Write a protein that binds this ligand. Structure first.
Ligand SMILES: *[C@@H]1O[C@H](CO)[C@@H](O)[C@H](O)[C@H]1NC(C)=O
Ligand SMILES: *[C@@H]1O[C@H](CO)[C@@H](O)[C@H](O)[C@H]1NC(C)=O
Lengths: 54, 55
């Protein structure tokens, strides 16, 4: 595939076909979002507001 | 009148003489000494954090 095409967020799936499968076909996909991440700014907020999520 | 003098139980009565009822009527006002004196233990509980969270 082209270098700049992968640079943008276009996902691909390499659908394979094998006999020993439940649905007889396996689909697995990737993209730049699925690649190696660099930064992780986990906020990990700690609040006394407990019951409600967010 | 002083607070302490009344606390001593002076038993003030406003004497009233009326034509229909010749006998004067007495109405005592005083502090019964039988009642004890226990100091209040006043406690101030701040608002529940469940109130502040709701905001
Ligand atoms: C993550 O780093 C960036 C700078 O690259 C910064 O602007 C951001 O505030 C950081 N995230 C935090 C502190 O959660
Ligand atoms: C994490 O970093 C990005 C910078 O790319 C920033 O836009 C985002 O707000 C940060 N996360 C939080 C929770 O602020």
């Amino acid at each position: 595939v082209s270098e700049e095409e992968w640079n943008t967020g276009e996902t691909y799936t390499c659908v394979v076909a094998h006999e020993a499968l439940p649905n007889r076909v396996t689909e697995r996909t990737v993209d730049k979002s699925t690649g190696k991440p660099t930064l992780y700014n986990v906020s990990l907020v700690m609040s006394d507001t407990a019951g409600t999520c967010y | 009148i002083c607070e302490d003098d009344w606390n001593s139980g002076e038993r003030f009565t406003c004497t009233v003489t009326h034509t229909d009822l010749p006998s004067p009527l007495k109405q005592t006002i005083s502090r019964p000494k039988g009642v004890a004196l226990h100091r209040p233990d006043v406690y101030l509980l701040p608002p529940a954090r469940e109130q502040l969270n709701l905001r």
